[PDB]
Amino acid sequence: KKSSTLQQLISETMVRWAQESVIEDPELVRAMFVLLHRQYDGIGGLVRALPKTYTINGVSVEDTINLLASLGQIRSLLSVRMGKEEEKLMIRGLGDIMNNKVFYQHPNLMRALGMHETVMEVMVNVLGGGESKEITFPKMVANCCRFLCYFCRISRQNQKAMFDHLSYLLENSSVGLASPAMRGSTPLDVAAASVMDNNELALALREPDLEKVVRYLAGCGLQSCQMLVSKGYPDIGWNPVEGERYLDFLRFAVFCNGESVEE
Amino acid sequence: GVEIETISPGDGRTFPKKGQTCVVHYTGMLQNGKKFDSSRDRNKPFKFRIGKQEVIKGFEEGAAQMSLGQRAKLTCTPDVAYGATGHPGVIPPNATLIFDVELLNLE
Amino acid sequence: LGVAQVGRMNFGKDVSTLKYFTICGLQEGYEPFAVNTNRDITMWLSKRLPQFLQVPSNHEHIEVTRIDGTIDSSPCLKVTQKSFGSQNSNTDIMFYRLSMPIECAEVFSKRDDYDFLMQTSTYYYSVRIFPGQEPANVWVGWITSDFHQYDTGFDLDRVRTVTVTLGDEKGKVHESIKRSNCYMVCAGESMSPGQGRNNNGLEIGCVVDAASGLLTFIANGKELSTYYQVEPSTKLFPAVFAQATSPNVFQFELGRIKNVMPLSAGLFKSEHKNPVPQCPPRLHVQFLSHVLWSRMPNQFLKVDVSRISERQGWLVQCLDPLQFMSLHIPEENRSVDILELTEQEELLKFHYHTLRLYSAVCALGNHRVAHALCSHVDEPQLLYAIENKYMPGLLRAGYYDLLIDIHLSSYATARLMMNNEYIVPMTEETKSITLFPDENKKHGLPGIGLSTSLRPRMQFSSPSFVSISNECYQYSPEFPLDILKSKTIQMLTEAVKEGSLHARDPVGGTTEFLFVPLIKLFYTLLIMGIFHNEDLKHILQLIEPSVFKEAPKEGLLQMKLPEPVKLQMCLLLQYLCDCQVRHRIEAIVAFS
Amino acid sequence: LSKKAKASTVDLPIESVSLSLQDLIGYFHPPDEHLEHEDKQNRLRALKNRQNLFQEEGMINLVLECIDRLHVYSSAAHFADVAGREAGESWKSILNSLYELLAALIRGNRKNCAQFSGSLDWLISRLERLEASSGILEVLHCVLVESPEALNIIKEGHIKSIISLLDKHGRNHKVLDVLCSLCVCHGVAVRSNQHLICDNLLPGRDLLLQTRLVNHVSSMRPNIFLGVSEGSAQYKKWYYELMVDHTEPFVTAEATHLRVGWASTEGYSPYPGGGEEWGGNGVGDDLFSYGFDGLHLWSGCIARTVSSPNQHLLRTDDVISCCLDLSAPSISFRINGQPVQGMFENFNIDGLFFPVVSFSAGIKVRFLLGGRHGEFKFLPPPGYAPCYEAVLPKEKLKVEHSREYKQERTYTRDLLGPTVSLTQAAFTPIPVDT
Amino acid sequence: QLILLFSRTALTEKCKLEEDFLYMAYADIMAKSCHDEEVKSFEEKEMEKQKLLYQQARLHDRGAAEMVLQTISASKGETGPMVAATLKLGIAILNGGNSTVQQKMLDYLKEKKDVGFFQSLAGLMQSCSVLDLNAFERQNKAEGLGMVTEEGSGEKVLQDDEFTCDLFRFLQLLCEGHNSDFQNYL
């Protein structure tokens, strides 16, 4: 008789099409076989779905809806090039998220929605846009870094999730160190918050990332500050302003919760 | 700067007063004769409040001078409609708009 | 068909209507020309009214040479006969015009000086009649778009004119308005001094005052007596009518004289303040021709005429609305039915790419641009393009994508970005959810059921252009989703039945053109989730009747579909699987 | 040659340059599609390697220098005056080949298209020139498609130049393709470019084709044919009436069309002249017809407002009286018995006139032709005769479609050829000279 | 058709071997189909050997031997789930020293003159990990501190034991049966 089930119907149809004719479209072949694998792997659907499943009380429904709307605006801004108005949209959305109570009350839902990933790559785009010509939209990097530092401070598991991006954050560590008033709002500050007061993360911190910071500090000690001499500051041979910022991260890496991490 | 020509007569008594909503179907054409807007295309009447600056001045004055059930032609000079900047993408700078407006209902 | 000849032509859409097919044509294996056509074949006939079309490069009688303007010479366009003198040459008056018109002002006002040239609105072009060409056979001046008069014998007295005289209540004519399609003068009468043309070709100078609508002509440096006054907003095309008495006939000269603007400065908007004369490639000579086809409408207005009585006269009645989409060519002030683009390839290509540009400028949530585009492409035009069966395939696919991009793509993407996340509230509705609808372990129809998981909110804005508020620029423009649902279901139901017969006349010309836009729109609507209950049941029965039957006919899954259609059917099946996964998750949370 | 050395002493390798420019294009020719997948991949890899080596050796700037030094001459004649005649002949071909080579060198290569950003500004500076527009457009299209950095440096001036290219050079779908690539690249939308393109192209409504829905309009006329000629037995004054039983102002989104008046024929053919058989055109759109819609006098598709007591569009229960005087060309109207302060005068009379009404869906009108056919609600003006008095003594007056083709079954549709001239309508007794 | 799609994707020009969920799932499916895995009788052992040969033939008759080499070559020496899945499938089709598969694999390499395959093998060997005493000590310090373990087995020390074993088992299977030709080719 008939398939009587969507799974059986799809499993029959895909094989029937493929054995009926040779498909010239790689996209069609890929879609057909993905669909067939989904029909034969129904357990994997639940395996993928459940980690992204969250339950909330009825009282938090409107707050969750507002948070999801803000997250949707932020996600949709990924597909457009950054400009003056996108700056405003990004900032107002991040502010609404921080003001919402669900952001604090449910860190697991925030981690499952991957807000840190979205903000991370949004800042990645801006950082990769125009490095030599000095970073554009510095207020964006500041707001993204403040959001990420708050995300780290909310929960210990969030700090571990942010720790996985320490490599790139240390690569883009010289973004706005020389610029004042951005203190606490730089990727280096995000990296420091990713390891602040966590023995588990301090011990997992490797050698090469420390070597990167050491090399940056050596460069700051050997060479002057280009942006400062451009503004007219006297040309000393070394860069105290960036050196101190690089030293703070090493402080946070070596000293943790009152005792000194020997490793 | 608005002169109104009557296409169909109305009651001639129930003019819009301050603090009312006017329900109209309008069809806007440029002076050359090209349509740029029409509420009849959207099939759903346009409501605006008298004196609350919701619409352009030319349309406001024309609707105020019209009466209930009257179909009239409204010609708005570029000083009472979108000035010299114009509406981006729709109305060019310094354009005279012609409106076919019917005052369906006053509420 | 010859003079006073009447004939009827049968394509055999209905076999019974063929009188002699059976006696001769059925057994021989010949097929009727309309054996597998659901809709009537379009009739094309020879156009009666001549139109202006560009002079072909392969023309047997006309040659056009575009002489470039030097430092001391203005750009010129020369018209000559390649076949003059030889046999088969045609000695008839031939009507020439320039492609772009000069538009007069909307409201009439009540060493050359550079400031005068910048504040002036007078434009000039001149025509050189080469020595040896009879000036009496050459006419120079301006014509409008209405000129469709092809007469072997042309005289200025025979032009079409009318005088509208609006008067006061008493009856005194306060104003009289002469309106005509031709404003031209003859060179033979312009030859006033005499013997001044044999030495050097005569030059009529045409000056148009776009601010006042005054058309005056100068010949050999002296103003002629004839002058024409036109009404505001008149679009005037430069035109020369000439009967050739020489291999070389005349020459369009696009120069300027003192205190007057060149013709290009009025023709083109970018050159509005450029005193240097120019002849851009857009400008070209056109001639009146009869080699054009006309498309008989598939459907006509139904009009009933009858004599009610002796006193009541003859009754003319028409109550059924009919409506067609008109495509307007801006430069030529012309308009053609969009279904005539089936045989006009260049316009079809340009319009398809224009539709693609429309879909691209409002891409990825540009709601302000979408609102602006709602003025150019309207709701009635979108619906008519969606439902029309004679639309060209390219335009069909363009208009479907334009509708989706302007009204639905934003919310479709909003729901697709949040499809893999399941934030289900804990309420009584959530508790009521179960894996299976009843005691029997029967799967319910996918989609149909109660879903409590949080989903993005759908909001739309009314696209009005009289309001001055700017809060409308968030949210995409509103559209009648109910009408869209009903018509989408209707057209899918029709298409499944029609394509199953493998008719030779699919909508758009190909099965891909018939199905890909329709299934894409249906998939967008399904993603948006507008379909509810009975509509979903019917459209699932359309996809597969037997499997989704609720407790022969072939569904979409078994019709020998093209690959692009197969890909979208795979997408629909993927969405149904996602719906099942969501139902399972919501039932797990209910148990928990 | 630029520094004005003798043309004879200068060695200009025209033939060698042309041959090397053709061989180079063949060398950078993209792989064909029908080839096998592995072979196509190998050819693509070789092409990419060649492009990388050329750009690392800086062969792009060499081609740019050749192009720049060739655009100093305005035209082939100018180049043949400065250099030799053969050089002038080959100038255009060499310019096209150089642009084709540049496009082949940068096509499909992200690094090359990113390196060409600095030269993009210099490239669009010569877009208007007719000898380089196509090649420049192709190079611009390749760069915009491949390199996201190009869109970051394309500015409002460049977009406006590309748009004015459409206005000066006519409709070209390649410009539209370039403009589409300006908006979205690799799935990322440039909102500034989108806004600039919209605000600089759309509002004009003068370059792109415009679309609109128009209600179908039909016309119906009586059998009579009224004409004036010297020595002809036809009365010059005529009169008829039309009353509207019902009319719906808005049956669709567009206004209902209803116009009444007189129309003429071209020459002596019974076929109405100057207008399309089908479409949205009615009484007054052409110069062969004269109309009145209750507010305007229509002729030649231009409408002028005419005064009248209690002006209104044609409503239900409106009696319209049309007067035609051929002795002195004059068409006058009277609405509901009151005169309309306006008339058509001094029109062409070398044809046959007939009553006509144009309409769209949603009407109910009745011809009052006088006599047995209809009764006049108002007395005709003195002199004017009812229109039924012009029927030939053998036929019957009836109201039929002005145009030949109507709504009926396709296989029963009567196809009509050209009709014989209706010269017998005007009876001029020809004298037999004696 | 599926194997042909996977082979074309590998042969397509890319700077990096992108992770493909479809490939990483269907390669596992094919490997499990291949292996399908109290003294047994000689007849029982022979039936098992013949069934394994048929199961391997169902794939290498359709071009899996070429695909598992093309994917490794396209990997360009980058360890990843795609490479692990390819190596497991290669082992599955090569179990028992399948001479037909060995001959197909050598003939393809000799005909195509593939250098990327051997370069990728060398890169994977260099990227293979060993014991890390410093990481072991750090994990011991963390465990003695009292914090919960993220992974029970301590995957940081000896990063991937399965990948290295599979990579070298693939090479051993290539040379089994005293396959002198391939032994010299390596």
Author numbering:
A (entry chain B): 2053 to 2315
B (entry chain F): 2 to 108
C (entry chain B): 1207 to 1316, 1414 to 1854, 1889 to 1929
D (entry chain B): 436 to 869
E (entry chain B): 3666 to 3702, 3710 to 3858
Authors' description from the paper:
Ryanodine receptor type 2 (RyR2), an intracellular Ca2+ release channel located on the sarcoplasmic reticulum (SR) of cardiomyocytes, is essential for cardiac muscle excitation-contraction coupling. Structurally, RyR2 is a 2.3 MDa homotetramer consisting of two functional regions: a massive cytoplasmic region, also known as the cytoplasmic shell, which comprises several regulatory domains (NTDs, NSol, SPRYs, RYs, JSol, and BSol domains) and the stabilizing subunit calstabin-2, and an activation core and pore region, which comprises the Ca2+ binding site and the transmembrane domains. Dysregulation of Ca2+ handling, characterized by aberrant SR Ca2+ leak, is a pivotal pathophysiological mechanism in a spectrum of cardiac disorders, including heart failure (HF), atrial fibrillation, catecholaminergic polymorphic ventricular tachycardia (CPVT), and other arrhythmogenic disorders. Here, we solved the cryogenic electron microscopy structures of ryanodine receptor 2 variants linked either to heart failure or inherited sudden cardiac death.
We chose the CPVT-related RyR2-R420Q and RyR2-R420W mutants because they are among the most frequent mutations reported in CPVT patients. Moreover, by analyzing two different mutations at the same residue, we were able to determine whether the identity of the mutant residue differentially affects the local and global structures. Recombinant human isoforms of the PKA-phosphorylated CPVT-linked RyR2-R420Q and RyR2-R420W channels were expressed in HEK-293 cells and purified as previously described. Under these conditions, we found that the pore of the RyR2-R420Q and RyR2-R420W channels remained closed, but the cytoplasmic shell exhibited a downward-outward movement compared to the closed WT RyR2, reaching the primed state. Calculation of RMSD normalized projections showed that the RyR2-R420Q had more pronounced conformational changes compared to the RyR2-R420W, but smaller than that of another CPVT mutant channel that we previously reported, the RyR2-R2474S. However, the mutant channels in the primed state revealed that the NTD-B is rotated relative to the NSol (2-4°). In the mutant channels, the NTD-B domain rotates and separates itself from the CSol and the NTD-A- domains, weakening the inter-domain interaction and promoting the primed state. In RyR2-R420W, the W420 residue also results in the loss of both interactions made by R420 in WT RyR2. However, due to its larger size and steric effect, the R420W mutation results in a 0.4 Å downward movement of the 298-304 loop, which might be not significant as it is close to the uncertainty level, measured as the RMSD between aligned NSol domains (0.34 Å), causing a less pronounced but significant rotation of the NTD-B compared to RyR2-R420Q.
